[PDB]
Amino acid sequence: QFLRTDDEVVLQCTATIHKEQQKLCLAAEGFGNRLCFLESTSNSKNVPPDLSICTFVLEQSLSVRALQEMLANGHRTLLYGHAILLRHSYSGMYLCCLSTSRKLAFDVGLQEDTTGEACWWTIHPASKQRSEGEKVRVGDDLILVSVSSERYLHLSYLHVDAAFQQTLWSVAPISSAQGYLIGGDVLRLLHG
C-alpha cells in the first residue's frame, strides 16, 4: 500500500528509442565493479532477468533537518521530502554518488561507509496533484536528488548517472515467515 521502511524494492524506467517500451530497471554488482548498470525487463518471456542483483533495501528515512542532526557529527513510512539510504540488498554496499564522470554528469557507485552526504537521496514528487508531506503509495513515479552532488538520478543515452536533468523513476515492491518457502531464494533440492 505504502512503502514502509526496511523492505525490498527497485527503481525502473522505460527507454523510448523509435517506439521502444524498453523497460530497464536498476542493477549494480559491486564486487570489483563499482559502477551501476542496466537490466531490461521488457524482454521477460524472452530472457528471465537476473533479479538478485537489482533489488535494494531501505535502511533509514529521516527529514532534511534530521539529516542535519545526524550530520552534527521503528518501521516508519517515508514521505515526499525525506532523505533515505539505499543499501544493495545483495552485496551489502550502500548506493552513493561518485565524484567522477564518464559534460559534468557524475557517476553512480556503491560504497561502504554511511558517513557523508554521498549515501543520501531526497525524494521529490512527480505530480502536480500529490505533493510534499504526504505518503508515497506503491508505484508512485518519483525523482531522486542527491544531497551532496544535488543532481537528478539521470538516465542518459545508455548511461545512468547523476546530472542536472530530471528523470522519472518508478518504484515497485519485491518482498517484505521463518522455516517457510519464500521466493527469490537459493536452496538445495534433496532426494532422500
Binding site: 542535519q68 550530520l71 559534468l104 552526504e117 551532496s148 544535488e150
Partner: peptide, 30 residues
C-alpha cells in the same frame, strides 16, 4: 567549514575547471 558552502563551492569547481587561464593569457596581449 559551514557545510553547504563547501558543496556550492564544489559546484563552482565543477564548472570552468581552471581552463580560464587560457582566457587569462589570451586577452592580456591583444
Amino acid at each position: 567549514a559551514k557545510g553547504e558552502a563547501i558543496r556550492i563551492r564544489s559546484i563552482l569547481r565543477s564548472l570552468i575547471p581552471l581552463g580560464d587561464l587560457v582566457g587569462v593569457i589570451s586577452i592580456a596581449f591583444q
